[PDB]
Amino acid sequence: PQSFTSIARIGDYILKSPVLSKLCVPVANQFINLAGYKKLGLKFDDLIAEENPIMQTALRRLPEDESYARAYRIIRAHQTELTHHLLPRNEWIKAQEDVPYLLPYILEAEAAAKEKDELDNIEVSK
Amino acid sequence: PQSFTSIARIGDYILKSPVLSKLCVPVANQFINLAGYKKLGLKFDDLIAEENPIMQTALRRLPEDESYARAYRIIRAHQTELTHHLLPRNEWIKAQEDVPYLLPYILEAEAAAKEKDELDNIEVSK
Amino acid sequence: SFSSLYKTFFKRNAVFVGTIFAGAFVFQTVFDTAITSWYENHNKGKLWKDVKARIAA
Amino acid sequence: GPPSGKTYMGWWGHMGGPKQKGITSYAVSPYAQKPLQGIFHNAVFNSFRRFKSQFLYVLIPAGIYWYWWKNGNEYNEFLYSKAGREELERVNV
Amino acid sequence: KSTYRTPNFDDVLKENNDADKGRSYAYFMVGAMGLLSSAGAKSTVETFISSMTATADVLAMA
Amino acid sequence: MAFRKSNVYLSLVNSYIIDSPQPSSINYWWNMGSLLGLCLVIQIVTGIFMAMHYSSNIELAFSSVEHIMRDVHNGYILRYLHANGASFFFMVMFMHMAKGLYYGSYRSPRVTLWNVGVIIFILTIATAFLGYCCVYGQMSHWGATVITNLFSAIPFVGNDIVSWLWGGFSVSNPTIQRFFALHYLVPFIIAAMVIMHLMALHIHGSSNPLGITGNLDRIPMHSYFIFKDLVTVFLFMLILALFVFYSPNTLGHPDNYIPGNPLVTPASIVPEWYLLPFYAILRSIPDKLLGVITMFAAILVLLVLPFTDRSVVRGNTFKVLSKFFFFIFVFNFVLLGQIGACHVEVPYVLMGQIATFIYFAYFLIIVPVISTIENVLFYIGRVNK
Amino acid sequence: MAFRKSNVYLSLVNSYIIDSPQPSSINYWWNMGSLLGLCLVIQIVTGIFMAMHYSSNIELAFSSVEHIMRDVHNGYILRYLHANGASFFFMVMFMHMAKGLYYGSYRSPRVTLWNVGVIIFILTIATAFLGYCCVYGQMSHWGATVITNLFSAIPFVGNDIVSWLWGGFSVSNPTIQRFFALHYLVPFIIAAMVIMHLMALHIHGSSNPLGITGNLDRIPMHSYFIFKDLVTVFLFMLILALFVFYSPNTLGHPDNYIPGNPLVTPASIVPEWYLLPFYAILRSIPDKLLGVITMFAAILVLLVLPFTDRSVVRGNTFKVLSKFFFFIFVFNFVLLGQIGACHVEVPYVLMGQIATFIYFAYFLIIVPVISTIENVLFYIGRVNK
Amino acid sequence: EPEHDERKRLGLKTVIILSSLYLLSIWVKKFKWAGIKTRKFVFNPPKPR
Numbered sequence A, B: 001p002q003s004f005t006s007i008a009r010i011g012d013y014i015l016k017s018p019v020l021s022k023l024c025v026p027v028a029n030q031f032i033n034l035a036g037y038k039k040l041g042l043k044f045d046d047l048i049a050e051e052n053p054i055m056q057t058a059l060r061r062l063p064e065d066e067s068y069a070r071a072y073r074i075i076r077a078h079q080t081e082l083t084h085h086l087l088p089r090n091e092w093i094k095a096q097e098d099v100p101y102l103l104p105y106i107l108e109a110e111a112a113a114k115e116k117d118e119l120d121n122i123e124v125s126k
Numbered sequence C: 001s002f003s004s005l006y007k008t009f010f011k012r013n014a015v016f017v018g019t020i021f022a023g024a025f026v027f028q029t030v031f032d033t034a035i036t037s038w039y040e041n042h043n044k045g046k047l048w049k050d051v052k053a054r055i056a057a
Numbered sequence D: 001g002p003p004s005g006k007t008y009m010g011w012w013g014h015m016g017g018p019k020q021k022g023i024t025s026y027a028v029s030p031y032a033q034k035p036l037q038g039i040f041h042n043a044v045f046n047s048f049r050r051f052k053s054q055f056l057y058v059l060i061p062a063g064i065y066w067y068w069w070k071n072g073n074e075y076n077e078f079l080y081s082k083a084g085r086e087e088l089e090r091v092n093v
Numbered sequence E: 001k002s003t004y005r006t007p008n009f010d011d012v013l014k015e016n017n018d019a020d021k022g023r024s025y026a027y028f029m030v031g032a033m034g035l036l037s038s039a040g041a042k043s044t045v046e047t048f049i050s051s052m053t054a055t056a057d058v059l060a061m062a
Numbered sequence F, G: 001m002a003f004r005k006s007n008v009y010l011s012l013v014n015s016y017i018i019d020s021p022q023p024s025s026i027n028y029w030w031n032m033g034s035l036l037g038l039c040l041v042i043q044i045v046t047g048i049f050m051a052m053h054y055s056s057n058i059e060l061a062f063s064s065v066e067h068i069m070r071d072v073h074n075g076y077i078l079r080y081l082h083a084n085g086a087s088f089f090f091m092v093m094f095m096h097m098a099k100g101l102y103y104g105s106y107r108s109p110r111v112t113l114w115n116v117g118v119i120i121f122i123l124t125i126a127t128a129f130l131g132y133c134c135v136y137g138q139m140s141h142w143g144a145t146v147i148t149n150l151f152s153a154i155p156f157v158g159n160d161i162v163s164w165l166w167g168g169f170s171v172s173n174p175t176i177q178r179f180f181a182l183h184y185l186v187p188f189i190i191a192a193m194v195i196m197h198l199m200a201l202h203i204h205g206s207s208n209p210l211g212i213t214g215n216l217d218r219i220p221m222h223s224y225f226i227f228k229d230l231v232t233v234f235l236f237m238l239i240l241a242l243f244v245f246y247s248p249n250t251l252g253h254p255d256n257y258i259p260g261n262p263l264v265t266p267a268s269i270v271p272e273w274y275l276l277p278f279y280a281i282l283r284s285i286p287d288k289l290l291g292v293i294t295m296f297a298a299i300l301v302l303l304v305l306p307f308t309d310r311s312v313v314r315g316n317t318f319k320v321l322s323k324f325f326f327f328i329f330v331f332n333f334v335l336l337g338q339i340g341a342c343h344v345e346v347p348y349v350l351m352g353q354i355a356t357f358i359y360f361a362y363f364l365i366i367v368p369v370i371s372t373i374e375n376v377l378f379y380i381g382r383v384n385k
Numbered sequence H: 001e002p003e004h005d006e007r008k009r010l011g012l013k014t015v016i017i018l019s020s021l022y023l024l025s026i027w028v029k030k031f032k033w034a035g036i037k038t039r040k041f042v043f044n045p046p047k048p049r
């Protein structure tokens, strides 16, 4: 329910402050390692809840080749969890591969929705 | 749920008998007048129950002009009954207009279904 | 006027429903007294209050 | 959900009757009509028309069973009086 | 017969069709229904609820 | 989409009450189904409020009903509503089942809907019988020892069944306490079979008095049959109020104001008036084992109707021989009920044995033969040859 | 098509327990729903068979329960099954509600399903309270006195509501017969609201432990989760049989074998163990009106959850801080029950006031603040800005 | 029958109120059904296709 526009606004301010980027990021890397989703063969962008209208347009506009790969990683994790095991250590998602591939398609869909709301409540300065 | 083939077989034997025709046909004419479906602007062939495959086949093969006319007589009868009245006497169906228009289509569909049942239970001799 | 009668009582449903309730409060009170008064007069000379008076005078 | 079997009624827009062509219908708003119109005329002339066409199907069966009941009730009163005590012996035992 | 020729509705129509007069008449007949039905609903819920209060024998031992 | 159609719960209300497509020509006989649902609500609500003051012990059951009439505020209204309401339940149900018989509502596309109704009819008879025993008057006690003793006629383990049903050696405290527990439960089973009743109706919809398809002219249920049903609701409520405030004991038996006594037997033992026709059927057979089978068959012969009807037209509207014999069966049912309230004397024994035969001959002989005859007359009356 | 799909009644069975598409990743925590269905059936059947030997008069209520244990054949089995079965009912329900709290099953698409569950929780608490009063021991009489006396704190109309509930001037014969009639009825309302529970689940289906969509890999319900539910069904009756035949009074209170006496206070008065956490919240507020309001708030704050969760991921599987603070709430709940069974002493008064604050601060403070922090950590931990 | 006097008085209010509701319901039903009751159909047979 917190919009990705607000998430990025706070995050980008932190990542440009030399002091703030020095203590928050090291504890954020350990937080992600302990989360353990990379050990099932998943990226973070695959964990976002998709039952909202905003995320339905982003998944529609995702390029076809990236969409086929995402379906394999999701099916693979369900089968791995079904056996109560983990993936072999060579199949884990690495740090350089955990990229926000779906993030640009969410920020653009959210900006369009925000502009629509501002235009249904327009007031001409008469 | 008596087949029209059975009704026609019994009915014809009465009509080809000179003795039986003079004693039974006069009774049938008075039976029809007392039934009173003509006073609602309907023919008898409009009263046959249609929720079976045999009558759904016959109604499919009926020509368009006959099918359009039948739909008007049925709608008119529903509205006349709604008001608890009868039709004006000049709008009643005459005896010469009460003809079995749908009967040949029903008999043709009934003969096909009987031959299918006799071939599914076939037994080859020698 | 019939136009000003519609604009006051039947245009808004908040006034139509509120008027019905206010008329139900009044009908409830008056209808009880009228029925009791008629019932007690059709049966004069037979109620306990009448009999109580005949053993006190 | 999965679809179900084929039925004989549909819904608004696909009710499943024959195709209709050439029928026009007209109607007037009830706010511009007169309800109760013709009730006094219908209360006597229409009621007599409906009663006359059906009363024989109801009264003849009713009168047959009522005559049977009264005749069988009167016979019982005769057997259990002093006049018909002799017949009560033979019929019973 | 052309479909532009409307049938005869003369013997069921009001000869003076006023919007305000004809609406106040109809709403006054449904308000009378809603007034009496609302009065009869009060007497129904009161009858059932009051049966759950103290009985005659219990009240005698107060 | 409108919220009344997208919501999960409002969609069920919309599809059954608001937007249900109805034939435009259904007359006032089609208003009995909605009345039967008002009777069920009346019985359940009045019964629950009376159950807060009832004791089922055999030495306290009769006196608890008087405590309801005398000490409970508005108690006599609740008791007279519940007692007379059960009598109005069977009036409406009897004429609800007679509409289906006259108009042929049991035919092929709606055979399953007809069979579920027969189940509801059986459960309603048991519910009324169980509640009548909960008063424990003289008719209540002695009517239970002639019904439960019927099962003793089963050849093997017939006597072990009645002992398990009694909870002892006769109708006693174990029997009365368990009959009240069952009288509380069966009404909730009835409410579950009404939903199954409505589910089987919603497949092909209802029928019409003309007996033909109604797919060419339909109107929504709301604002047309919602307000037409309100007419019979206010008329049903007026007649019942006349029987509750002005004649509350006309339909009862005065022997049920005497407390139940196993040592004194009443002069005449009869059930309530709506069970009299089946009581007369049971007494007609001069054998105990065959009598209870015949009495139970009298409810099960309704299931052979879809197969013994041989007509190609659904209904009795345009038939003169079927119309005449329909009212012979109706007035035969009244004569059967009157025999069940009579003594076992010389003329009444033979009359019951003939009216019992006419009951079964109608479903198995009269209907098949007459239907075939009218099929032929409709044919030779228009096919010139 | 197959007869299981074309029939009107079988199609509801097929669509719910045969062909229902289930995610392939759901673990054994998704088995508590089917167990709650078996618990409800057990309670209804044992209650009905026990009600054939029970009397609700205040002078015979205690002795009728003793009559069931001693005189009725296998009657002690029915009573211990019903008393212990109700304790196992709340065990599963507590775990059923904590599963959905851990896995975020209350979130956006399934808010209606979550709201219906809260209504079932309220009704079940009332049903268990009403049945405890029907024994009429020393803890049931004095427990009913304190609970029903809290309604007198309502302004203006408070004192009149208590008299209407009691049926008199204190907990007496009108109250006890009142409560048995309601104890028979409310379980049927629960059964009708369970069907509405399944209807709201069928629109979007179940969730999965991973918290992502399950539309890419599904298996039918029959022969895969029918036999997985049979595993926990057999384990459920094994533990229940241990408590029924080898320790039937471990979960009860010994003071409920002393018949109810309105003249002797039974020292400490406490309810059953599953209502103890909510009893401690009521006692923590030194004000009758405010303290009573806070007790129903503890059940109504569960509706605020879908709006104070500011997380873009559903569930706690991959959340570090949310996993830690989830078990703080769980063990805070256990400590609240311990305080509810304690006396009003020096340390225990402040212990229950702080633990009450943690209960409410979890929904309104901890969850919103934590869920926003983790959103940033997920972001800045992989973006190169 | 110690409630005899009060029962008959309450039956006078029930019947009067219920008789006036029943009559008011017949008018309301007839007002809602006026459009359907007074409805006309015409048929012009279509030309062959």
Ligand code: HEM
Residues within 6 Å of the ligand: F029, F030, F031, F032, F033, F034, F036, F037, F040, F093, F096, F097, F100, F103, F105, F106, F113, F114, F117, F118, F120, F121, F194, F197, F201, F205, F206, F207, F208
């Ligand atoms: C409490 C008992 C019952 C209730 C509430 C009930 C309810 C209904 C309702 C609401 C309808 C649709 C409207 C109508 O036709 O009036 C209906 C139709 C029907 N019912 Fe019942 N019913 C009950 C008992 C029975 C019984 C006992 C039978 C037969 C033995 C039966 C057979 C039918 C049939 C055949 C129809 C369809 C008739 C038609 O539409 O032409 N029902 N019922």
Ligand code: HEM
Residues within 6 Å of the ligand: F040, F043, F044, F046, F047, F048, F050, F051, F054, F065, F079, F082, F083, F086, F089, F127, F128, F129, F131, F132, F133, F134, F135, F183, F184, F187, F190
């Ligand atoms: C279809 C529903 C029901 C029917 C047909 C029915 C029928 C009856 C009948 C015929 C009696 C006999 C009354 C007399 O002869 O004076 C009775 C009595 C009784 N019934 Fe019901 N009943 C129904 C539902 C219920 C329910 C659900 C309850 C309780 C929850 C209930 C509680 C009682 C009680 C307490 C009596 C006591 C005797 C009396 O008050 O007259 N009933 N019932």
Ligand code: HEM
Residues within 6 Å of the ligand: G029, G030, G031, G032, G033, G034, G036, G037, G040, G093, G096, G097, G100, G103, G105, G106, G113, G114, G117, G118, G120, G121, G194, G197, G201, G205, G206, G207, G208
């Ligand atoms: C007698 C009481 C109840 C019954 C019979 C019942 C039944 C069920 C069943 C069979 C399921 C699907 C299977 C499963 O998820 O294990 C389910 C799911 C669910 N129930 Fe219940 N339930 C009851 C009470 C509750 C309560 C008290 C709550 C919450 C306060 C609740 C909330 C939920 C939720 C949120 C789900 C969906 C969870 C998911 O699929 O991830 N239910 N229920």
Ligand code: HEM
Residues within 6 Å of the ligand: G040, G043, G044, G046, G047, G048, G050, G051, G054, G065, G079, G082, G083, G086, G089, G127, G128, G131, G132, G134, G135, G183, G184, G187
């Ligand atoms: C969800 C359903 C139910 C629950 C949770 C429940 C709960 C309880 C509880 C906790 C007791 C206290 C027993 C004790 O402490 O020894 C009790 C007693 C009792 N209940 Fe239930 N009950 C349910 C359904 C029913 C039903 C449907 C009936 C009757 C039809 C019933 C009849 C009784 C009776 C007669 C007692 C008497 C005391 C005893 O036998 O132990 N119960 N109930």
Ligand SMILES: COc1c(O)c(C)c(C/C=C(/C)CC/C=C(\C)CC/C=C(\C)CC/C=C(\C)CC/C=C(\C)CCC=C(C)C)c(O)c1OC
Residues within 6 Å of the ligand: F185, G016, G017, G033, G034, G037, G038, G040, G041, G044, G045, G048, G191, G192, G194, G195, G198, G226, G229
């Ligand atoms: C695995 O799949 C399932 C699943 O199969 C089920 C059933 C459920 C449970 C779902 C439900 C909706 C629960 C169903 C139950 C009810 C709604 C209530 C149950 C009702 C009863 C037990 C009432 C029955 C009572 C009786 C028969 C009374 C007994 C008394 C008798 C027989 C008296 C004796 C008779 C005489 C004549 C003396 C699931 O949640 C589920 O997971 C999806």
Ligand SMILES: COc1c(O)c(C)c(C/C=C(\C)CC/C=C(\C)CC/C=C(\C)CC/C=C(\C)CC/C=C(\C)CCC=C(C)C)c(O)c1OC
Residues within 6 Å of the ligand: F016, F017, F033, F034, F035, F036, F037, F038, F040, F041, F044, F045, F048, F191, F194, F198, F229, G182, G185
């Ligand atoms: C669609 O066509 C139909 C139609 O099919 C039907 C059946 C009916 C008629 C009937 C119904 C729709 C209702 C069907 C009835 C049932 C399913 C019976 C169910 C039972 C009830 C609704 C009653 C339940 C009542 C209670 C639980 C209340 C008990 C009292 C209590 C709790 C008060 C005590 C309170 C305290 C605090 C002690 C129609 O009117 C109708 O036209 C619209």
